[PDB]
Assembly symmetry: C3
Homo-oligomer: 462 residues x 3
Amino acid sequence: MNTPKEEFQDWPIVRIAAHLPDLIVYGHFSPERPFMDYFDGVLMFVDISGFTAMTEKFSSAMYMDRGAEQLVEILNYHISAIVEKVLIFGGDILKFAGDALLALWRVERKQLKNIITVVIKCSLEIHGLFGLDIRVKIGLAAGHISMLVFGDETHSHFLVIGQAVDDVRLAQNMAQMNDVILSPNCWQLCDRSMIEIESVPDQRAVKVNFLKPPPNFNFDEFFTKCTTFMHYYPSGEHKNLLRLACTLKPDPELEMSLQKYVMESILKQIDNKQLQGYLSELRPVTIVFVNLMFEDQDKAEEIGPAIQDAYMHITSVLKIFQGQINKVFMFDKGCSFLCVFGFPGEKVPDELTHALECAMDIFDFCSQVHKIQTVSIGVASGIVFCGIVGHTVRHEYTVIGQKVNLAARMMMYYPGIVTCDSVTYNGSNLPAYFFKELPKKVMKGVADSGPLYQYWGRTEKV
Amino acid sequence: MNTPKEEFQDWPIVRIAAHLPDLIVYGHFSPERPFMDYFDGVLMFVDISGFTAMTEKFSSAMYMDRGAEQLVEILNYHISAIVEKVLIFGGDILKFAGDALLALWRVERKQLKNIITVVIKCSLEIHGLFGLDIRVKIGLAAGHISMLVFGDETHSHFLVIGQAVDDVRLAQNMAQMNDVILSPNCWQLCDRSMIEIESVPDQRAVKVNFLKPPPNFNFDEFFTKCTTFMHYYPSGEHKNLLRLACTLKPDPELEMSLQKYVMESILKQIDNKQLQGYLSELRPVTIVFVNLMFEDQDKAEEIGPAIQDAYMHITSVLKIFQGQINKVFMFDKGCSFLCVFGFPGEKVPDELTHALECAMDIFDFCSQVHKIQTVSIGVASGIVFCGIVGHTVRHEYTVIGQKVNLAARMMMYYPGIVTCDSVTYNGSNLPAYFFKELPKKVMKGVADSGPLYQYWGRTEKV
Amino acid sequence: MNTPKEEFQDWPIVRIAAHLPDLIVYGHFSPERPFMDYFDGVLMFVDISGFTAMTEKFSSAMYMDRGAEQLVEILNYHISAIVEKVLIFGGDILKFAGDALLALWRVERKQLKNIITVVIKCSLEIHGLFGLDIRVKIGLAAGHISMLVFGDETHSHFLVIGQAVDDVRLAQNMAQMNDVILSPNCWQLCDRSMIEIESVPDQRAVKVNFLKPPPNFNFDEFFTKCTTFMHYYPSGEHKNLLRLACTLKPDPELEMSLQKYVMESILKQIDNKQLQGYLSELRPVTIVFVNLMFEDQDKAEEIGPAIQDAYMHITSVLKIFQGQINKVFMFDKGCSFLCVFGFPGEKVPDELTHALECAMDIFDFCSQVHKIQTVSIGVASGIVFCGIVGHTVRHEYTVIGQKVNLAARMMMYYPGIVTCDSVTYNGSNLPAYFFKELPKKVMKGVADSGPLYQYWGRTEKV
Ligand SMILES: Nc1ncnc2c1ncn2[C@@H]1O[C@@H]2COP(=O)(O)O[C@H]2[C@H]1O
Ligand SMILES: Nc1ncnc2c1ncn2[C@@H]1O[C@@H]2COP(=O)(O)O[C@H]2[C@H]1O
Ligand SMILES: Nc1ncnc2c1ncn2[C@@H]1O[C@@H]2COP(=O)(O)O[C@H]2[C@H]1O
Ligand SMILES: Nc1ncnc2c1ncn2[C@@H]1O[C@@H]2COP(=O)(O)O[C@H]2[C@H]1O
Ligand SMILES: Nc1ncnc2c1ncn2[C@@H]1O[C@@H]2COP(=O)(O)O[C@H]2[C@H]1O
Ligand SMILES: Nc1ncnc2c1ncn2[C@@H]1O[C@@H]2COP(=O)(O)O[C@H]2[C@H]1O
Ligand SMILES: [Cl-]
Ligand SMILES: [Cl-]
Ligand SMILES: [Cl-]
Ligand SMILES: [Mg+2]
Ligand SMILES: [Mg+2]
Ligand SMILES: [Mg+2]
């Protein structure tokens, strides 16, 4: 009796799970919303500097209208290799955001010290990897982490919250190119007999200099010991897989739950109802970057209800005005929503007008939500890259472009109001007196925005 | 000199052959029609109970308009595993019909006894396999089998005929859930020193209790002995393949012959002229289930000409009224044609009217065909699953739904006339006096049909 | 720490490189145009006789409108196996032209003798391979070879030039079916102690009879010695690959350079923006076969500027009149351009008129280009096969059909004028007095053209 070749089976549930971390795929938690979970771990925030400039250049004539295709190919070639290292070292990629990603090693408290060594080794190998134009910056943090799941009956989003989350982003902001920076708490928890550092001026964070193994040390045996604490590390018969999620089997309940995290247009491609090519594009869109600030951004039980409340309104008005949520995460002393007008399928004219009217609506509503202290919204329009970024086994739909960064910086440098760039202003059908021309601020990571405006809106205020 | 990787070659001829059994792929018989062949073998009829209920539930809001995709994934995940067992145990899957299949082990007469043991072992392993909602029933028969191939210059169909065919379906109808039932002839031919059974009340068929190997018995060596008699069992260099048909090589003559069995829309997908997604759908259709009854349904040389004659008319009027033959097989003391109006591409309004006019046309014509004793036709309309069911190496286009079962039961409980359900009646553009409201019958496997009608047709009859 | 499965990565750059030889993929030469390179090597010109007849037959009713699909499948099944042999024996496939191909073994002069033995062995194995209707003819030549790259800022073409190029085609023209013929220079350079030949009447070329290895000879060890001189022979870890180009990694500069050789419609398929099925078709087109004759067709520095100059005009007027260059190569004492009107996407009516007006335009322009001695153009219209021919790792878009051959023969037998077949004449919207009916010539490889015409054009000439 034959024992024939079992082909890898690429069920729709496996393709869906590629868009999600193990934290969701294997979480089995309540469908109640908001839902909050608490744990400990190590976080790693990896940023490629320089793709957003490459993006601009891929629209030029030399790319012969295949700029989107060239960009996604070169981006994924690099990002894939980072994703593989994270996964082989036992991490869960939580999220991609443009040309950056956030990874987690969830463990019990007593295992933090050793897992931190694993994550540093991983980070140093990633620095190893990387025309001669892009750099990799890495921030690490460790400690208590909260997760929030929010959403409605057909859509789900999650994000992580707390000091370690705030620290991982601060650490990465300080990294100079090719640095690995540890948060103060990470440095306090780590194996100081192995990890040599250098102080960072005016900071308590530190920079990794090198690993100093002791005399008997064997990294592979140490790593094996740490894998005891890793619930989903592929092993035994599945030791040749990058993710245990590759072995998921059809299960309608689980798939119904997982699909709610993934955008319709991506589900259409998964279901072989649209060609893959269509979702990689360099197209004019409008970004609406919404920031919600709280008194205490580290306290999930406080902020969770508020984010849910805001989300319910946001999703409704985005649908009316033809926009979509691309990403949600903690940033800017708050929860930020990256919303997009003009994604695959969602084109119109008066897209600009809509973006602005939607932004004012969100601003008015969210400003009255209990515990939301300040709302800021940045609106910017231009050509942006949209497509699936990452590895075959772990990837997500994302946007990359100078206008994405501009909207986020506007939102940060002009708090408490709705602002817009020049393209949005000049293109909208709205009267000029609905706007106010603003003082120009020097803004970290933007060479020249053109004039910026406040969208003051309809009735006068003075 | 290198000896490089020979990639599996997925020629169009191999993809076509996935839709067909070895009985056709390797049959090389005459293109004359009708064509009849005679042989012996063991048949296995495997039924999953409960998908037709799941079908209804996959249209509900909780599936978020991906019901078709979820259904086909969960169905195929289960059916594939049954298909693999059949193929590894040396069987040829002849046909899928909804959530059921029919398999054959063709052998010389002297080998029936031992092959019956192989098929029982296979069936018991299949019971082994199988939310907690579906059951597997299995009927086995053995003896003389006839095959009929019929069709025209561009379309071919086959079916199997005779007592063993009738017996395999009777056996499976008696199976309670997870039973394997042997036909009287199967039980009479089998190795009684190994197969322990239990009587079935008011029947001569028997139920398998268990296998009782004797002291020296080794199933793998016995199986090896039986493979001597299996013409196409994958072996040697190809022992890692589930089917020898995976190795078919381009050959325009053979492909011209094989493609005539496969529907145009499936050929379009094979030829990468339409996305795979498009053929899995849950869509409103009209089923027209036609039964032709003969004096002796087991005598191919008698019934073959008649089926061919009926087929020629049926295919012509279906084309006029925009329907298609999905399946043909022996059932209901006769040859049944499962015809569908509304398949991928074939949508219209007045689809209901057409179905009914076509059914009356077929009824009038077939009733005059020599040797056709009675025609019955059931017409029912609702949401049904349409798509490719089975394993990658062996699969077919099929329909599944409560309206499919309803049309078949109508045809069986209301012989000699054309009947229709309420949806068809209320939706057609036909005057009410073309119909007669009928007494409601309690019908095995239908909880509530709503009112049923005879399509009496145009001129009065009284 | 796991060392998981590295999946083959099918980047867009690898798919592009499938359409190109190593000579371009690894050439890294100047973007200046014309560019000329000089080297030595052995050439092999392999022709399948009989596909062009099969082509006609695949349009007939018995193929049930899947003629294009059947043709490409049977063609590629055979061509692939020849491609594999060429690649395993260390050759670079330069170009496909219909059901023929041209391969090169580039080596230093001192290695020609031994490489010629490798190529003969390869050719003899290819004869080995091959309803019972097609024959393989092979011509071999060896010596100095020039390459010309020409084109504009977004399109590139290359071709090879010189005596060896002319000789390989002459050699193949003399081959009777299943012969391998050596050019005079090849026979003069080869290892005469191993290669036994037979004279060819009225020729200095010779026919291979057989290989006569000497007593100690081991072909595999000899082949290994010859691989020292092969720059891109897959080896070591990549010894299981048919081409080193399978390992190409994303690199935007290189991809920008390579894509310029490939047609837009093929790039669209590579980019998963169109289904594969669409490019295999049997469709009515118009072929415009343009021949440019020079005083000395073997002198690249002389003819290179002229081809570039002609190309710049040709590409411009083809774009105005909706045609495309399919292929360019040396043939007919000149450089020939195979141009097509009606390819995927480029349909119109007055396609015939356009073809003819474009041909006259090209004729008038090219006749004044310095060093172009005579222009001849053949225009023929009918059903032709269009699609991707070759192996997965090395394939190209090509056209096959009796009208392709007819246009080339017209161009050759009616030099110095623009001619057209009957279909083109009768279908064009042009007045009859713009044409002249011509004497019918017996034309090698055409049984009956129907009447042929000179397109005399608008103003009278007498
Ligand atoms: N695709 C994207 N998704 C999410 N955030 C983005 C994206 N592109 C840019 N950003 C944000 O732009 C910000 C610019 O300032 P920072 O670098 O502090 O933090 C950056 C990100 O949070
Ligand atoms: N693992 C370690 N344990 C103790 N001291 C350290 C370690 N790594 C670095 N240091 C010292 O900590 C210092 C902090 O300031 P400096 O970077 O000037 O130089 C650093 C080292 O001298
Ligand atoms: N897709 C299908 N193809 C063929 N027959 C079907 C399908 N769905 C239901 N049936 C028939 O419906 C019948 C209901 O009664 P039985 O179970 O006796 O036999 C069943 C089948 O023959
Ligand atoms: N292989 C076998 N050979 C002989 N007798 C059998 C076999 N299997 C079962 N039986 C007996 O046949 C009987 C028929 O009726 P029962 O099921 O009541 O119990 C059954 C067993 O006692
Ligand atoms: N697809 C094609 N591409 C290029 N040339 C072709 C094609 N089909 C036929 N030919 C030419 O047709 C010619 C007929 O005469 P020859 O055989 O001398 O040379 C042949 C080729 O050069
Ligand atoms: N490798 C070789 N070296 C020397 N002579 C040869 C070789 N191969 C063939 N010949 C002879 O060359 C001859 C040329 O004419 P013939 O073909 O009549 O017969 C041929 C052989 O007799
Ligand atoms: Cl997050
Ligand atoms: Cl059947
Ligand atoms: Cl060439
Ligand atoms: Mg970045
Ligand atoms: Mg069933
Ligand atoms: Mg040819």
